[PDB]
Design a binder for this molecule. Structure first.
Ligand SMILES: Nc1ncnc2c1ncn2[C@@H]1O[C@H](COP(=O)(O)OP(=O)(O)OP(O)(O)=S)[C@@H](O)[C@H]1O
Ligand SMILES: Nc1ncnc2c1ncn2[C@@H]1O[C@H](COP(=O)(O)OP(=O)(O)OP(O)(O)=S)[C@@H](O)[C@H]1O
Ligand SMILES: Nc1ncnc2c1ncn2[C@@H]1O[C@H](COP(=O)(O)OP(=O)(O)O)[C@@H](O)[C@H]1O
Ligand SMILES: [Mg+2]
Ligand SMILES: [Mg+2]
Lengths: 340, 254, 159, 327, 258, 335, 258
């Protein structure tokens, strides 16, 4: 029963092993969980719309809230979870969602009311609402407007612009903030201590620095570093270099070579060095980000050069965000910034 | 609480067959003198109203009325387990989230039990029945079904006209026109085949054939059907039960 | 074909004579202006103004029916300076509750049916409007997108 | 009980006297109903302006407490096709009421999602059955309705809620709830609403939940800004000043510390800087053209994701290069 | 000569609109011609077919040419049309109003008084789509055959790598002139390796005996790799003559091994 | 041949020793293993390394696999036919074998399938549509104790950020020319090839650009032309499409007109009709146009800018020739 | 060769009705002691296995086993000519490309003969039946059909739970939950209505309702159905014939496995 769950969690990757089960495990998204804890004692949970960067804990927060609300018994009877792996057209929204909303709430047991608040409403959550078409979204308007007495709607998305304006107005907007080093160092250190991850001083803070506001990627990188340090068995501590090696970060010397080729060099030398660099597998997004950090941070370039480098890096990132060829985009970016 | 045991699951199944298709949501209410149920279609032209007295049951206990709403389709989906001869017991607490249907065979053997999820419906039972109708008539329900099934093919509207000693059903559409004329008569060789008519005022009303077709289903509950018509209100088609009745109120056309 | 001003004016005068309504010349002019050759819409607006205020005056007609939407959009697009067009878009359209989709779509219609400017500049303005229409359909519909569309149209008109 | 509904649903207006903001249309509709001549209505407006509440209160005032039976209310949640029209709407219009005597009301809420064939079939239903029933069409976009259907109804444009009416509703809510609100906090709340009562009610409930107290204290600007995650005008103007005057590295550091100290979003800062720079009396419109174009491009890129630092540097560089033409 | 009733009730064949989009009348205002053409494109409702017509016609049309930039400006519109057409399946068709503008850019850019003759047109795209489908189906069948035999090869073979790298080399190996090899042992070893390769790819040698009275039933490979690899019509004839002698030798070796 | 000499375990790998050690570290504890995404250049050997890692997570029976068929029904009666590579320990799906119906196959098959878990290898994850990736986003997290994904791709550019975060990222850098030469040496000593001078092998690497799959195939193709005896000046065997692209660039730099644009469109049609992707065509065309010594830096910069623009266009469009012809016309206008 | 004559074509028609729908390909094999047949569905969760001994036939001759595979749909299409009372003879040579079905009426009168094309299927008969199952039970098949038909409406999964003297079928889904509880009992008034149960170990398995629905068809072949369950293997549902049996082996759902 519970022991099987404990063992399955212990044999699970750290992303799912340390998933927040209660509203207190949320480390940084405090403004939303404060309201969620206050409404736990009341019974006026409004329709909610979670939006923010990926890996901020929206799904974990709503799961912990539904748990703390309904208990592990009513967790499976008063919840309608619809993900992006299911059909969510107009037909589905009109039939299934509306039939579940029109239905009455299931009767709680005697053990439920003694430990959990058991609100008189159920919860219908729609994860990854970006893939929902606007007509199927507008179909949900009156469905969530008239049956609010018996069901509550929780939308979850990454881009709040993909959801129509009426739905965004009907739901309370909860913006999840990026999890940088400051507001996630406590959670990362807790995960490291619970797994006996022996690292150096500036490793964890560096990991989140590579994560760029993503605790899931940081936990995955920490798990990979711990596995790589346990395989060696040397008993030493994990270093920031070993972490940034497996994180896809280009070494500093290779980036300085690119800066030298951009500063001094013609089209042919730059093209040859780019062709050689693309042989070693590096993500073009990470290279663009590192070049942006170096160029904007270095206090040795003119402001007129800085405006142009910022606009060129922005254009290159916008083009790379569409599935383009990394080699062509990187070569074009380096050539355009070399003419400056 | 709700505790109603039907001798034969078949009676309840035929009753629900009557609400079937023409309505989606039904609001039941059990009380000290029995069970009532009302359902109105989306366009609000048809009301299906049921009344089952305490005596229609093999066992009925009620110390506290309970009102419960449910999806008709869900109910019928479950209403084919009665074996017809099975015993059926409807059960619910005073503040239900579900309705329990319990089918059992005479012997302890097989027990099929269902727990149907309820819907919350604002309690608002209508009381649109009239004291007097312009005209009243009863005739075998199988005859009424045939009359409706005939005319239906010709039009989406079937007119019922009543004059002294004459009842006339008429349909007129694309392929042509049709009419069925019946006259009152007492058959002593068996009065369940007689056709009675009491006319206080001639009437002439038109109904949507699609609705009359829904209504004829009541034939399975009673040998005769009573039809009460008025120019002031919805028409009443009634199918009597032993201690009870199933009524269909249908609003005339314009 | 469309009904000229004279025919709708004559029909409205006949209706007023048959109904004994208090009216004025500027009120009937505003009614016909907001009708746009639509006799049914003209009679409907007249009846609504009568039942809402009693006197058919241009002030009442304008307060109960907004000005022809396409005309404000045309005046916004035909603006000579960027600040004038921005102020028009802000006050007349955005501060009155007009959705961005209606603004951009009305904008497309006005341009397609425009005749003051040449064909190439009209096609470029339609291209910019349609790029804004694209952005808006993806859920990025805000005031900044319409402002950028107007800026690009003015840059095209800036030789 | 009504104490379980959210504040957006709990405070839904039930009478026409509780619908604030709309006065020219509310009075005209009241006169239409009192004098008897109620034409086919077309309530066009943005979300959260009070069109559905207005028509519901109107039907309540017309038919009484039995509104839910004498009115046919169809919306996008229900199947609205051409056959649905042909059967349901025509049978409702052709027949009469089963509860009383009087004209009927068909409320086609959110009718901007109806099919073109459905509107083409309904435009002759509205014109044929017009002595015993009426039609009310609610819309957010007037481009999704055919011109034939658009010409048969009297159009009422629901303007966004002004300051007076939204403050009146806020005062009503503060009377109904054991809650106090600061004046500057109220002004900041009105600023982040754009005439949307839903947002105001939602964030008011959320900041009441944020109070953490038995509500013996007040709600200040800090509570509102920390609960809605919106940037403050102080940090907004500080970032704008550091971008316009200070050095590139210093501007980058200022933007980073501002967006990381309160967890602010780059899109909110972009919109705030756009709103602030709209009042700037500037030179030749080329700077405004470049600024608007680059800011809209960066906003459209943010609407799809990417590197937040790269986009922030892009915003800084775009504003700087746009203002470099003003000299 | 019957056309009066057509002018009375029928629209403008999309082909006639395409030829009108490349014509400028010197005696009418360019704006009036533009609005007349816009109304004709809108009334037809088939903006896509008109544009595909314009795309096939523009290379053959006479247009005062400076550096063939006009074509570069039109590639950006055509790309705008393709994005708009993709969005029509994702979004409610509000964007359909802008589809009529793209054909009118051809009238602005390429409309000339020189274009007096009607250029007839065809549908290369449907034929190319059916050919691309047939080639994709052949490739999908080869990829399935590799998955059933080669347990590991299937993990390293992408559809693109199979078409551009593997199949052209495999065909060059089968089409190689074995008549130049004097060493019988080396010829036998190569033929045994080629039989192993034909087996790994599940390539069957079929004797097509569909030859009317002419005494050489040509051997064909099933699936026909030749239709996917051989883009050049000159190389097709050279390869077919060489393959016929190789395939008979390979069939004899497959029969010997059987 | 490439297939006759291929490593089957982690100890049989012969390049990227740090990557082999990282894979051994990741396979030391196989049950607490997150999802993996192998990214890098095409032809590096990531599909062999994933199977070698599975050979360490499970028994040697992972390579004994079979091809089955599964049918699917879309919203209409069009039947989707998809073949599946299955093994008693893992299964492989390639959603790049159909059109916009990747989401259906992904969701249904993965839900049906969902040591103790069964591994899933998604081949060519770049062809996965955004809707299919969104559908897989929650399937990756809901079933993490029964299904582990090993997605093989050549570039994480089209992969969405949620999927990137939901799995570990493993880069596979192309092997150095020295390692390629050492591998070709063992191959030619095992296949009994005659080398007059060893340096030719190095040149093979210099003609493959890190690609081992292309290197071995070209070595074997030129070994059949030299009759199993490679000389000091053996010609380099280039694929037919590369020669067509080179001739196209020669035609481009020689003549810049509309009459030549027609034959350029014809060549593009003939290339696209023979199962050649348009993105690779554009990449090779641009890279070989930059190699033209007749042009200057001003021409090459405009060429690379137009190629990036039209690559974005092609990634946002579906009619590939509509963008290829536009890029060719823009290059003609530039020169 | 194959030479099997059924007294009544009806028996064969009902047997095939059992394979019908749930499987596409069936592999038959006739031999000295009778005929066997096996069919596995695509997902491999259901195996349909038949055995008809020599005595079930009116005439059976076999001096040389023959294995033959065929499409189930094709077979049933032809299996409605038996008049039920017609005589049916299955005929095939030792290396068949077809199977002949010969229906004849008593008198020489009408002779319907079919020649069904065969499919080549790799012979690989499974032998997954267990020595002992955790629990064994039999009950009237019409009762089992009703039990399955009840619960099916509620869910795509029906759980079977066995404890001492108790058999419980349960379904739980969207609209609610249902259960059918039966108890062992000997009815002497006619023992074909009894419900037997032998439990060596309590069992609790879940099956996909769609499959149980396919299985209930066997009611038409036997009055009773035997159900054997184990936590170590597919469940066995068996319908006895006079000299023979039709068996359905169904793999329990793992959590999601039919
Ligand atoms: N605030 C947080 N506190 C603790 N752990 C967190 C937090 N946010 C994310 N995580 C970890 O990251 C895992 C993923 O959480 P999710 O809620 O799925 O992230 P996400 O916001 O849903 O990203 P998506 O699904 O791509 S939008 C959790 O199981 C935790 O292990
Ligand atoms: N004028 C108003 N006065 C008071 N409360 C209002 C007003 N407008 C909106 N509200 C509040 O906002 C809630 C939603 O109003 P609705 O009428 O549903 O919005 P809407 O105008 O119909 O826009 P939609 O439904 O998105 S098209 C109401 O229940 C009220 O609580
Ligand atoms: N460790 C290795 N040592 C030697 N050759 C290898 C090794 N790994 C892969 N190869 C070979 O190098 C080439 C790599 O191409 P391919 O296998 O298609 O790459 P991928 O595995 O990424 O699909 C193939 O010939 C492959 O068999
Ligand atoms: Mg999520
Ligand atoms: Mg509304």
């Amino acid at each position: 029963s519970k022991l099987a769950a404990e063992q399955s969690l212990a044999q699970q990757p750290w992303v799912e092993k340390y998933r927040p089960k209660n509203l207190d495990e949320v480390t940084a998204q405090d403004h939303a969980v404060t309201v969620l804890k206050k409404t736990l004692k009341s019974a006026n949970l409004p329709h909610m719309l979670f939006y923010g960067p990926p890996g901020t804990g929206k799904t974990s927060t709503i799961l912990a809230l539904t748990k703390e609300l309904y208990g592990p018994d009513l967790m499976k009877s008063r919840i309608l979870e619809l993900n992006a792996s299911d059909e969510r057209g107009i037909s589905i929204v009109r039939e299934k969602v509306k039939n579940f909303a029109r239905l009455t709430v299931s009767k709680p047991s005697k053990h439920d009311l003694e430990n959990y608040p058991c609100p008189p409403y159920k919860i219908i959550i729609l994860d990854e609402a970006d893939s929902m078409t606007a007509d199927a979204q507008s179909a949900l308007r009156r469905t969530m407007e008239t049956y609010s007495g018996v069901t509550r709607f929780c939308l979850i998305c990454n881009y709040v612009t993909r959801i129509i304006d009426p739905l965004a107005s009907r739901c309370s907007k909860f913006r999840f903030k990026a999890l940088d080093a400051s507001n996630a160092i406590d959670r990362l250190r807790f995960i490291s201590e619970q797994e006996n991850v022996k690292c150096d001083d500036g490793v964890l803070e560096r990991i989140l620095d590579i994560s760029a506001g993503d605790l899931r990627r940081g936990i995955t990188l920490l798990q990979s570093a711990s596995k790589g340090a346990q395989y060696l068995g040397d008993g030493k501590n994990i270093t920031s270099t070993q972490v940034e090696e497996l994180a896809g970060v280009v070494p500093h010397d290779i980036l300085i070579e690119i800066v030298e080729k951009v500063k001094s060099g013609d089209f042919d030398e730059i093209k040859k060095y780019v062709n050689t660099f693309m042989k070693s597998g590096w993500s073009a997004a990470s290279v663009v980000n590192q070049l942006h950090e170096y160029y904007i941070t270095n206090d040795n370039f003119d402001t007129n050069f800085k405006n142009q480098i910022s606009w060129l890096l922005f254009t290159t990132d916008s083009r790379l965000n569409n599935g383009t060829n990394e080699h062509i985009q990187l070569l074009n970016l380096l050539v355009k910034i070399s003419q400056l | 609480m709700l505790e109603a045991k039907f001798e034969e699951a078949s009676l309840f199944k035929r009753i629900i067959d009557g609400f079937k298709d023409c309505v989606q949501l039904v609001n039941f209410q059990c009380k000290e003198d029995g069970i009532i149920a009302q359902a109105v279609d989306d366009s609000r032209v048809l009301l299906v109203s049921l009344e089952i007295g305490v005596e229609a049951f093999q066992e009925y206990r009620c110390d506290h009325p309970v009102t419960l709403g449910m999806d008709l389709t869900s109910l019928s989906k479950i209403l084919r387990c009665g074996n017809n001869t099975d015993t059926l017991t409807l059960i619910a607490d005073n503040t239900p989230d579900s309705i329990i249907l319990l089918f059992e065979d005479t012997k302890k053997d097989r027990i099929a039990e269902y727990s149907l999820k309820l819907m919350d419906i604002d309690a608002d039972f209508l009381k649109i029945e009239e004291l007097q109708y312009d005209s009243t008539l009863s005739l075998p329900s199988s005859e009424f079904s045939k009359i409706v099934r005939d005319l239906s093919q010709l039009s989406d509207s079937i007119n019922i006209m009543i004059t002294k000693e004459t009842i006339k059903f008429v349909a007129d559409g694309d392929i042509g026109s049709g009419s069925v004329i019946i006259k009152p008569f007492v058959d002593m060789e068996h009065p369940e085949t007689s056709i009675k008519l009491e006319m206080d005022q001639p009437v002439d009303l038109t109904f949507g054939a699609k609705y009359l077709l829904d209504i004829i289903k009541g034939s399975s509950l009673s040998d005769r059907v009573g039809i009460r018509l008025s120019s002031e209100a919805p028409a009443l088609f009634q199918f009597d039960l032993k201690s009870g009745f199933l009524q269909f109120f249908l609003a005339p056309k314009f | 074909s469309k009904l000229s001003d004279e025919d709708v004016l004559k029909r409205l005068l006949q209706i007023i004579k048959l109904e004994d309504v208090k009216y004025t010349n500027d009120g009937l002019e505003a009614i016909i202006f907001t009708a746009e050759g639509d006799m049914r819409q003209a009679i409907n607006n007249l009846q609504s103004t009568v039942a809402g205020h009693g006197l058919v005056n241009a002030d009442n007609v304008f307060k109960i029916v907004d000005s022809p939407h396409p005309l404000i959009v045309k005046k916004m697009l035909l603006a000579s300076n960027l600040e004038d067009s921005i102020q028009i878009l802000r006050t007349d359209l955005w501060k009155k509750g007009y959705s961005s989709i209606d603004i951009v779509t009305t904008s497309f219609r006005v341009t397609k049916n425009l005749a003051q400017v040449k064909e190439s500049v009209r096609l470029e303005m339609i291209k910019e409007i349609g790029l804004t229409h694209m952005r808006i359909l993806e859920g990025v519909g805000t005031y900044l997108q319409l402002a950028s569309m107007l800026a690009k149209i003015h840059k095209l008109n800036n030789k | 009980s009504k104490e379980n509904l959210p504040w957006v649903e709990k405070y839904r207006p039930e009478t026409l006297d509780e619908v604030y903001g709309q006065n020219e249309v509310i009075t005209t509709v009241r006169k239409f109903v009192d004098e008897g001549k109620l034409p086919h209505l077309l309530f066009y407006g943005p979300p959260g302006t009070g069109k559905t509440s207005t028509i519901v209160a109107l039907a309540r005032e017309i038919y009484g407490k039995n509104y839910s039976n004498m009115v046919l209310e169809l919306n996008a949640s229900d199947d609205r096709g051409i056959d649905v029209v042909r059967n349901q709407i025509k049978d409702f219009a052709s027949t009469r009421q089963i509860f009383s005597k009087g004209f009927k009301l068909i409320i086609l809420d959110e009718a901007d999602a109806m099919t073109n064939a459905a509107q083409n079939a309904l435009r002759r239903v509205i014109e044929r059955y017009t002595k015993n029933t009426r039609f009310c069409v609610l819309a957010n976009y007037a481009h999704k309705l055919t011109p034939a259907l658009l010409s048969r109804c009297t159009r009422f444009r629901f303007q966004p809620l002004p300051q007076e009416a939204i403050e009146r509703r806020i005062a009503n809510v503060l009377v109904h709830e054991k809650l106090k609100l600061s004046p500057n906090a109220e002004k900041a709340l009105i600023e982040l609403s754009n005439g949307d009562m839903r947002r105001v009610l939602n964030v008011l409930q959320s900041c009441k939940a944020t109070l953490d107290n038995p509500d013996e204290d007040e709600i200040s600007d800090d509570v509102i800004y920390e609960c809605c995650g919106a940037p403050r005008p102080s940090d907004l103007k500080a970032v704008l000043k550091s971008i316009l005057e200070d050095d590139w590295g210093t501007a980058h550091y200022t933007l980073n510390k501002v967006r990381s100290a309160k967890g602010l979003a780059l899109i909110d800062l972009i919109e705030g800087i756009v709103k602030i720079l709209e009042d700037y009396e500037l030179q030749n419109e080329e700077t405004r053209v470049h600024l608007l174009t680059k800011l809209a491009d960066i906003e459209y890129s943010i609407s799809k994701g990417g590197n937040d630092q790269i986009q922030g540097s892009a915003v800084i560089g775009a504003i700087k290069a746009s203002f470099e033409n003003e000299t | 000569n019957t056309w009066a009733s057509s002018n009375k009730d029928s629209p403008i064949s999309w082909f006639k609109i395409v030829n009108q989009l490349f014509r400028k009348d010197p005696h009418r205002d360019i704006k009036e011609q533009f609005y007349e053409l816009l109304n004709q494109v809108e009334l037809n409702g088939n903006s896509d077919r008109i544009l595909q017509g314009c795309f096939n016609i523009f290379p053959y049309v006479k247009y005062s040419d400076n550096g063939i930039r006009k074509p570069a400006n039109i590639s950006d519109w055509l790309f705008f049309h393709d994005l708009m057409y993709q969005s029509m399946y994702a979004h409610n068709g509000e964007l359909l109003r802008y589809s009529a503008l793209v054909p009118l850019v051809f009238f602005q850019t390429f409309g000339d008084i020189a274009n007096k003759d009607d250029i007839r047109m065809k549908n290369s795209e449907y034929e190319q789509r059916e050919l691309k489908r047939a080639n994709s189906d052949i490739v999908s069948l080869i990829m399935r055959h590799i998955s059933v035999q080669s347990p590991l090869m299937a993990s390293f073979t992408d559809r693109k790598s199979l078409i551009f790298e593997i199949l052209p080399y495999l065909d060059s190996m089968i089409s190689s002139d074995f008549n130049k090899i004097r060493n019988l042992k080396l010829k036998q070893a190569i033929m045994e390796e080629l039989v192993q390769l034909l087996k790994s790819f599940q390539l069957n040698l079929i004797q097509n005996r569909s030859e009317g009275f002419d005494v050489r039933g040509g051997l064909t490979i099933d699936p026909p790799i030749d239709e996917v690899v051989l883009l050049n019509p000159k190389h097709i004839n050279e390869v077919q003559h060489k393959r016929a002698n190789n395939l008979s030798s390979l069939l004899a070796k497959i029969e010997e091994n059987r | 041949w490439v297939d006759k000499y291929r490593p089957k375990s982690l100890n049989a790998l012969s390049h990227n020793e740090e990557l082999t050690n990282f894979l051994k570290s990741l396979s030391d504890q196989p049950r607490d293993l997150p999802h993996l995404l192998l990214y890098g250049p095409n032809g590096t050997g990531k599909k062999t390394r994933c199977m070698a890692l599975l050979e360490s997570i499970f028994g040697p029976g992972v390579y004994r696999l079979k091809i089955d068929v599964r049918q699917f029904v879309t919203a209409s009666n069009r039947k989707l036919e998809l073949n599946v590579v299955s093994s008693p320990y893992h299964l492989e799906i390639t959603p790049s074998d159909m059109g916009n119906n990747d989401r259906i196959v992904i969701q249904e098959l993965l839900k049906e399938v969902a040591h103790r878990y069964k591994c899933v290898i998604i081949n060519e994850a770049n062809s996965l549509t955004k809707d299919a990736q969104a559908a897989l986003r929650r399937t990756m997290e809901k079933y993490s104790k029964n299904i582990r994904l090993i997605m093989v791709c050549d570039s994480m550019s089209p992969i969405i950020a949620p999927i990137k975060s939901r799995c570990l990222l493993i880069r596979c850098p192309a092997p150095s020319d020295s390692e390629i030469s050492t591998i070709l040496s063992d191959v030619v000593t095992n296949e009994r090839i005659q080398l007059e001078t060893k340096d030719i092998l190095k040149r093979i690497a210099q003609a493959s650009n890190g690609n081992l799959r292309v290197s071995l195939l070209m070595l074997e193709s030129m070994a059949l032309n030299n009759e199993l005896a490679l000389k000091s000046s053996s010609p380099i065997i280039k694929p037919d499409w590369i020669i067509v692209i080179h001739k196209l660039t020669r035609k481009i730099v020689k003549e810049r007109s509309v009459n030549s644009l027609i034959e350029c469109r014809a060549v593009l049609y003939d290339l696209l009709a023979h199962c050649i992707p348009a993105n690779i065509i554009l990449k090779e065309l641009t890279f070989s146009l930059l190699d033209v010594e007749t042009l200057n830096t001003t021409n090459k910069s405009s060429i690379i800018e137009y190629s990036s623009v039209f690559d974005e266009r092609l990634s946002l469009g579906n009619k590939a020739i509509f963008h290829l012809e536009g890029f060719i016309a823009k290059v003609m206008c530039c020169l």
